[PDB]
Design a protein around this motif. Structure first.
Motif, PDB file in Angstrom:
ATOM      1  N   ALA A   1       0.834  -1.180   0.000  1.00 57.57           N
ATOM      2  CA  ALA A   1       0.000   0.000   0.000  1.00 57.57           C
ATOM      3  C   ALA A   1       0.881   1.246   0.000  1.00 57.57           C
ATOM      4  O   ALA A   1       0.608   2.185  -0.733  1.00 57.57           O
ATOM      5  CB  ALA A   1      -0.914   0.003   1.203  1.00 57.57           C
TER       6      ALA A   1
ATOM      7  N   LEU B   1       2.626   1.683  -3.533  1.00 61.99           N
ATOM      8  CA  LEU B   1       1.682   2.032  -4.582  1.00 61.99           C
ATOM      9  C   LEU B   1       1.357   3.519  -4.488  1.00 61.99           C
ATOM     10  O   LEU B   1       1.325   4.214  -5.501  1.00 61.99           O
ATOM     11  CB  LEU B   1       0.403   1.196  -4.448  1.00 61.99           C
ATOM     12  CG  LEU B   1      -0.605   1.271  -5.599  1.00 61.99           C
ATOM     13  CD1 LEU B   1      -1.363  -0.028  -5.680  1.00 61.99           C
ATOM     14  CD2 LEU B   1      -1.564   2.430  -5.400  1.00 61.99           C
ATOM     15  N   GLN B   2       1.138   4.006  -3.270  1.00 59.58           N
ATOM     16  CA  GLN B   2       0.813   5.415  -3.034  1.00 59.58           C
ATOM     17  C   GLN B   2       1.957   6.379  -3.343  1.00 59.58           C
ATOM     18  O   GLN B   2       1.735   7.575  -3.512  1.00 59.58           O
ATOM     19  CB  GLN B   2       0.413   5.617  -1.572  1.00 59.58           C
ATOM     20  CG  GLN B   2      -0.341   6.897  -1.312  1.00 59.58           C
ATOM     21  CD  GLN B   2      -1.785   6.819  -1.803  1.00 59.58           C
ATOM     22  OE1 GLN B   2      -2.587   7.723  -1.561  1.00 59.58           O
ATOM     23  NE2 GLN B   2      -2.122   5.730  -2.491  1.00 59.58           N
TER      24      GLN B   2
ATOM     25  N   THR C   1       4.606   5.719  -5.863  1.00 58.32           N
ATOM     26  CA  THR C   1       5.343   5.352  -7.059  1.00 58.32           C
ATOM     27  C   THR C   1       4.671   5.812  -8.344  1.00 58.32           C
ATOM     28  O   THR C   1       3.512   5.492  -8.596  1.00 58.32           O
ATOM     29  CB  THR C   1       5.500   3.841  -7.144  1.00 58.32           C
ATOM     30  OG1 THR C   1       6.180   3.370  -5.980  1.00 58.32           O
ATOM     31  CG2 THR C   1       6.275   3.457  -8.376  1.00 58.32           C
ATOM     32  N   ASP C   2       5.406   6.556  -9.163  1.00 63.51           N
ATOM     33  CA  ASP C   2       4.880   7.032 -10.439  1.00 63.51           C
ATOM     34  C   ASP C   2       5.140   5.953 -11.477  1.00 63.51           C
ATOM     35  O   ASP C   2       6.183   5.963 -12.127  1.00 63.51           O
ATOM     36  CB  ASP C   2       5.581   8.321 -10.856  1.00 63.51           C
ATOM     37  CG  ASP C   2       5.201   8.754 -12.246  1.00 63.51           C
ATOM     38  OD1 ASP C   2       4.122   8.330 -12.723  1.00 63.51           O
ATOM     39  OD2 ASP C   2       5.968   9.519 -12.864  1.00 63.51           O
TER      40      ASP C   2
ATOM     41  N   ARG D   1      -5.092  22.950   3.369  1.00 63.37           N
ATOM     42  CA  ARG D   1      -4.960  21.514   3.539  1.00 63.37           C
ATOM     43  C   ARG D   1      -3.571  20.973   3.259  1.00 63.37           C
ATOM     44  O   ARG D   1      -3.377  20.218   2.315  1.00 63.37           O
ATOM     45  CB  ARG D   1      -5.985  20.822   2.660  1.00 63.37           C
ATOM     46  CG  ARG D   1      -7.401  21.195   3.033  1.00 63.37           C
ATOM     47  CD  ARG D   1      -8.413  20.425   2.216  1.00 63.37           C
ATOM     48  NE  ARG D   1      -9.772  20.642   2.698  1.00 63.37           N
ATOM     49  CZ  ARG D   1     -10.817  19.908   2.324  1.00 63.37           C
ATOM     50  NH1 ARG D   1     -10.652  18.905   1.460  1.00 63.37           N
ATOM     51  NH2 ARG D   1     -12.032  20.178   2.804  1.00 63.37           N
TER      52      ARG D   1
ATOM     53  N   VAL E   1      -2.908  16.970   2.283  1.00 62.95           N
ATOM     54  CA  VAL E   1      -4.073  16.161   2.651  1.00 62.95           C
ATOM     55  C   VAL E   1      -4.146  14.811   1.978  1.00 62.95           C
ATOM     56  O   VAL E   1      -4.581  13.842   2.586  1.00 62.95           O
ATOM     57  CB  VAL E   1      -5.382  16.870   2.333  1.00 62.95           C
ATOM     58  CG1 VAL E   1      -5.775  17.750   3.491  1.00 62.95           C
ATOM     59  CG2 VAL E   1      -5.220  17.682   1.065  1.00 62.95           C
ATOM     60  N   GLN E   2      -3.730  14.748   0.719  1.00 69.06           N
ATOM     61  CA  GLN E   2      -3.777  13.498  -0.015  1.00 69.06           C
ATOM     62  C   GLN E   2      -3.105  12.380   0.752  1.00 69.06           C
ATOM     63  O   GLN E   2      -3.665  11.295   0.896  1.00 69.06           O
ATOM     64  CB  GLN E   2      -3.092  13.649  -1.364  1.00 69.06           C
ATOM     65  CG  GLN E   2      -3.687  12.734  -2.388  1.00 69.06           C
ATOM     66  CD  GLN E   2      -5.200  12.884  -2.428  1.00 69.06           C
ATOM     67  OE1 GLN E   2      -5.724  13.985  -2.654  1.00 69.06           O
ATOM     68  NE2 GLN E   2      -5.912  11.778  -2.198  1.00 69.06           N
TER      69      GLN E   2
ATOM     70  N   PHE F   1      -3.952   9.011   3.859  1.00 69.62           N
ATOM     71  CA  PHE F   1      -3.414   7.667   3.720  1.00 69.62           C
ATOM     72  C   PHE F   1      -2.763   7.237   5.020  1.00 69.62           C
ATOM     73  O   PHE F   1      -2.957   6.123   5.484  1.00 69.62           O
ATOM     74  CB  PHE F   1      -2.357   7.622   2.618  1.00 69.62           C
ATOM     75  CG  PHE F   1      -1.554   6.347   2.592  1.00 69.62           C
ATOM     76  CD1 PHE F   1      -2.073   5.190   2.032  1.00 69.62           C
ATOM     77  CD2 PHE F   1      -0.266   6.316   3.110  1.00 69.62           C
ATOM     78  CE1 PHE F   1      -1.322   4.023   1.986  1.00 69.62           C
ATOM     79  CE2 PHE F   1       0.499   5.157   3.071  1.00 69.62           C
ATOM     80  CZ  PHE F   1      -0.029   4.005   2.505  1.00 69.62           C
TER      81      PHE F   1
ATOM     82  N   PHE G   1      -6.444   5.532   6.286  1.00 68.34           N
ATOM     83  CA  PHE G   1      -6.382   4.245   5.590  1.00 68.34           C
ATOM     84  C   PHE G   1      -5.374   3.214   6.083  1.00 68.34           C
ATOM     85  O   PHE G   1      -5.764   2.091   6.407  1.00 68.34           O
ATOM     86  CB  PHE G   1      -6.171   4.459   4.085  1.00 68.34           C
ATOM     87  CG  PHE G   1      -6.162   3.178   3.285  1.00 68.34           C
ATOM     88  CD1 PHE G   1      -7.293   2.385   3.206  1.00 68.34           C
ATOM     89  CD2 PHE G   1      -5.009   2.749   2.651  1.00 68.34           C
ATOM     90  CE1 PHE G   1      -7.273   1.190   2.517  1.00 68.34           C
ATOM     91  CE2 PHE G   1      -4.983   1.554   1.960  1.00 68.34           C
ATOM     92  CZ  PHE G   1      -6.113   0.774   1.894  1.00 68.34           C
TER      93      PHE G   1
ATOM     94  N   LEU H   1     -10.112   6.212  -1.762  1.00 75.10           N
ATOM     95  CA  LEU H   1      -8.889   6.954  -1.501  1.00 75.10           C
ATOM     96  C   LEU H   1      -8.135   7.151  -2.812  1.00 75.10           C
ATOM     97  O   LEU H   1      -7.646   8.244  -3.090  1.00 75.10           O
ATOM     98  CB  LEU H   1      -8.015   6.203  -0.488  1.00 75.10           C
ATOM     99  CG  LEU H   1      -6.799   6.947   0.071  1.00 75.10           C
ATOM    100  CD1 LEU H   1      -6.501   6.439   1.458  1.00 75.10           C
ATOM    101  CD2 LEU H   1      -5.592   6.759  -0.829  1.00 75.10           C
TER     102      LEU H   1
ATOM    103  N   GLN I   1      -1.064   3.695 -13.635  1.00 76.47           N
ATOM    104  CA  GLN I   1      -1.252   4.023 -12.235  1.00 76.47           C
ATOM    105  C   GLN I   1      -2.407   3.250 -11.635  1.00 76.47           C
ATOM    106  O   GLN I   1      -2.275   2.657 -10.567  1.00 76.47           O
ATOM    107  CB  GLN I   1      -1.519   5.511 -12.070  1.00 76.47           C
ATOM    108  CG  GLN I   1      -1.029   6.014 -10.747  1.00 76.47           C
ATOM    109  CD  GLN I   1       0.417   5.603 -10.519  1.00 76.47           C
ATOM    110  OE1 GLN I   1       1.305   5.926 -11.322  1.00 76.47           O
ATOM    111  NE2 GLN I   1       0.662   4.877  -9.425  1.00 76.47           N
TER     112      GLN I   1
ATOM    113  N   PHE J   1      -2.830  -4.643  -6.519  1.00 73.36           N
ATOM    114  CA  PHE J   1      -3.139  -4.325  -5.124  1.00 73.36           C
ATOM    115  C   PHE J   1      -4.510  -4.717  -4.588  1.00 73.36           C
ATOM    116  O   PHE J   1      -4.589  -5.430  -3.586  1.00 73.36           O
ATOM    117  CB  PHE J   1      -2.914  -2.830  -4.852  1.00 73.36           C
ATOM    118  CG  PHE J   1      -3.149  -2.433  -3.414  1.00 73.36           C
ATOM    119  CD1 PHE J   1      -2.347  -2.931  -2.402  1.00 73.36           C
ATOM    120  CD2 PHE J   1      -4.197  -1.597  -3.075  1.00 73.36           C
ATOM    121  CE1 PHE J   1      -2.590  -2.608  -1.083  1.00 73.36           C
ATOM    122  CE2 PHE J   1      -4.445  -1.270  -1.756  1.00 73.36           C
ATOM    123  CZ  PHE J   1      -3.643  -1.775  -0.760  1.00 73.36           C
TER     124      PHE J   1
END
Lengths: 532, 532
Positions: free
Chosen positions: A367, A370-371, A373-374, A512, A515-516, A520, A524, B370, B516, B524
């Motif tokens: 998780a 993945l959040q 990595t481009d 914010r 915030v993204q 997470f 999450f 998310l 992506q 995932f």
């Protein structure tokens, strides 16, 4: 005499010091607790017995016994943080910088240094309160507290090493500033405590702890907050590490008395030599002995305390640095070097994520990756490096602080958030590190004002701006000048969530802060790890 | 006579039809299987017994018994898909469009219509192969197959309703094109099958199924692939729905014979009236009766078949539409209207995610939300709408197809990927829908060439380009002209992963179509749902 002060603990002889071609008083090395040596090790601090005659407070005191960094011998970059004085178990002293002439009842500011709760000194060059005291006309106090095992070993249930004795140390110093700062010209009913890293976490901890609340008016937290994944442990883990530490020095582990006694007979540098062996996981940005949720200093869990509004409702001013993470990757994540662009490969990026989120199972490691990595450029060395750099900062400093500020603001009486994103021109660390952890401090203490330190004219302009925000806030509870024509630092509100950048450019307000990712890390991932 | 053809099943009299101010032959309604009525319902198709005399093949045949959409009476937008002929359980016929003069051995193209396996007709206006046959000079075949319960009811273990009989229908039609297209001028050793939505899934299924492999040369899959979450079920679920269907019509459920017999005595419109009641979850983009992994038509699971290289290695040309999802949200997600901008609120966005990923637990619903929410603008009605729109498409069409193309390309002999992102100028659906599901078809069949249909000059230019790609590919296995001066449609490769956009603008090549998200949906989320 302006340099002689009569406190409730006895008389003290300070010394006159030069600053920005003028002078101020400085009372260095005033004691606030009895030396925590001998059988007093690991034990709660005791008030310093009064003394007769005049205490000579014209030179810095000793530094607490601590781990010293030698990863870069000579490098000013890392040594400006190592202790500059004789380390000794007799460390509990505080420093006062008073203006001249002596004020009648001016504003007080107490600085609690940071250091991951395992290092730190008040005597460092960067923490010289004369520039600030002088420029803003405030009494600047600098306290010290025990770190590492000496201040955080915790065998809950016993009185020989309850735990958090290091936080009690800080509280002691605050009690003394409360019972005596009036004799130095300071107003006890207007003391602002402010800290950085572990200091920012300590500041936040006095806001939560019932026994410290009544001892200060406002607070300033920098790059750190009480609910950071590294700032505290459970009694169980605290106990586990207490024992293991003992197991490394070959001590009788039959009972606490057994253990505690063996530890008190060891030389200070022996506990320190094995201190790092007690960590539960191979990790980055995690420290051995830290505060523990004991049920005393902290009534319940921190999360429920923040949710119930159980904490000092006042005003606070806090923020973070753009690149909090880089400093720890350098020292611990494979692939980073002080002398290269440190581009990181897929293999090393992933070893990075494993070291950064030590408590996550394999699903969580995925998780996180993945959040961050481009996938349109997964083998871009510079992208994996800055991403790893971001993970470390978001998880450890930035996203935990935003959780605090958002929970606090719901019961507080005023919040001011900042985002320091300016890299000093004279930094000695590589560029890939950027706006490094802790380097915003030099602006708070105004080192840019002293020419010989080589700062750009705009940088000095930034230092004065910041000193005036901190100082104005400490005095009024608002970083802004009543009827100023300057740009107003908007108030943070649950609804808007505004904040400002802090650099040499025309003030820009935003919203914010990250915030993204803060969602997470605060909503999450926690949830994911619980169900799995 | 050019209109009289002698097949191995008997003679057939076709009819001459006008096209783009010229003429071509058209043999409509040729039978390829025995009428699947009476006791033959749910049962595998049987070869059509030969016939004496000349079969009159000058008018379209009937449409399979199906569910008809009445969500927008009159609206050409939805009716251009409803059956335009008398529905009847006697539906298994195929249509042939042959050039004039009759070719000796030209290229063949077999079109398998889509419809979620629950609807579809070959006789629709949009599937008129004359424009294509004429413009590219190819024999265009259009087959039909049973849909809904009539073609996919599955009680594994019995011979009364094995399942996949609908796919066998298609195979039958392909067998006939293989044994007879030579008499219409077509070359049986060069037949390209191509489909859309469920047709694209069927095409992909003949590539996997051992019993169909030998019946075609190349394939073209559009907006659909065999491993789509809606394109197939397990024998267990197939059985569960078979029974439930029976339970809704009050049938004896003691044994399969019990059930099957009761279903055969029901009128066609009765199975259809309750068909939708058997779905396991409240969902969007899921259909009642579909193909089932039975162990026959499909040796093993689809995933392992794709991993083992067990499938027809040939060349394929496939792609997706920019906005695959919108069509289903309109009809099923709360908040969308054919006559409004359909801006969606947080409440409705989340009800949207629940309807879109029906099999996900609460942790997964959070993971999906998310990944698809811009927390810097969470209440932006247009952002939540397009995000919901994206979720539906990515999960159902786009990310499942990219998994196929990537697994295929590893053993195939040539892959060509496209991304149709042009919205026709004369579309009757709202704008918020965009490049709608299935509307790329009109360009493949060349409706832009017929003036009276009102298409821009550039749109007609696009139609000819595409017809030449499809046709050139069908003939050579490469969409490009040997020594052309036009822009080359690059080959898709495991390494590069290039693809092209397909619109009225200068061809632009790209890479890693939506990686992506394709990683979230293919790697995932699957993993997350397994561990939790």
């Amino acid at each position: 005499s302006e340099l002689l002060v009569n406190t409730k603990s006895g008389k003290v002889m300070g010394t006159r010091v030069p600053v920005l071609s003028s002078h101020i008083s400085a009372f260095l090395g005033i004691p606030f607790a009895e030396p925590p040596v001998g059988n007093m090790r690991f034990r709660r601090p005791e008030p310093k017995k009064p003394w007769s005659g005049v205490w000579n407070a014209s030179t810095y005191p000793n530094n607490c016994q601590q781990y010293v960094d030698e990863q870069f011998p000579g490098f000013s970059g890392s040594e400006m943080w190592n202790p500059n004085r004789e380390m000794s178990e007799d460390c509990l002293y505080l420093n006062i910088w008073v203006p001249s002439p002596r004020p009648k009842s001016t504003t007080v500011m107490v600085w609690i240094y940071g250091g991951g709760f395992y290092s730190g000194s008040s005597t460092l060059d960067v923490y010289n309160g004369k520039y600030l005291a002088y420029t803003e006309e405030v009494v600047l106090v600098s306290l010290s507290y025990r770190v590492g095992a000496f201040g955080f070993l915790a065998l809950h249930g016993s009185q020989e090493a309850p735990g958090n004795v290091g936080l009690l140390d800080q509280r002691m110093a605050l009690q003394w500033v409360h019972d005596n700062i009036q004799f130095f010209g300071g107003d006890p009913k207007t003391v602002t405590i402010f800290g950085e890293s572990a200091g920012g976490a300590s500041v936040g901890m006095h806001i939560l702890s019932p026994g410290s609340r009544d001892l200060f008016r406002r607070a300033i937290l920098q790059s750190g907050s009480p609910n950071c994944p590294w700032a505290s442990v459970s009694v169980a883990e605290g106990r586990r590490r207490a024992v293991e530490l003992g197991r490394n020095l070959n001590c009788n582990l039959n009972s606490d008395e057994e253990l505690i006694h063996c530890l008190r007979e060891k030389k200070p540098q022996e506990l320190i030599d094995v201190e790092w062996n007690v960590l539960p996981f191979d990790s980055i940005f995690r420290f051995s002995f830290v505060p523990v949720i004991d049920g005393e200093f902290f009534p319940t869990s921190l999360e429920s305390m923040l949710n119930s509004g159980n904490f000092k409702k006042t005003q606070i001013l806090l923020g973070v640095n753009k690149d909090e993470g880089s400093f720890f990757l350098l020292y611990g994540a494979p692939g980073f070097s002080k002398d290269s662009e440190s581009k990181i490969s897929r293999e090393d990026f992933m070893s990075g994520v494993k070291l950064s989120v030590p408590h996550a199972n394999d699903l969580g490691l995925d998780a996180v990756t993945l959040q961050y990595t481009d996938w349109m450029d997964d083998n871009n060395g510079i992208k994996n490096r800055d991403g790893l750099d971001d993970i470390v900062g978001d998880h450890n400093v930035i996203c935990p602080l935003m959780h605090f500020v958002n929970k606090y603001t719901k019961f507080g009486n005023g919040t001011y958030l900042y985002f320091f994103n300016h890299r000093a021109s004279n930094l000695v660390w590589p560029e890939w590190m950027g706006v490094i952890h802790g380097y915003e401090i030099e602006f708070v203490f105004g080192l840019p004002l002293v020419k010989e330190l080589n700062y750009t004219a705009e940088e000095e302009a930034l230092s004065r701006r910041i000193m005036h925000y901190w100082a104005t806030f400490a005095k009024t509870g608002n970083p802004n000048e009543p009827h100023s024509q300057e740009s107003k630092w908007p108030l943070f509100t649950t609804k808007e969530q505004k904040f400002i950048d802090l650099n040499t450019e025309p003030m820009k307000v935003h919203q914010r802060l990250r915030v993204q990712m803060c969602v997470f890390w605060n909503q999450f991932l926690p949830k994911l790890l619980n169900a799995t």
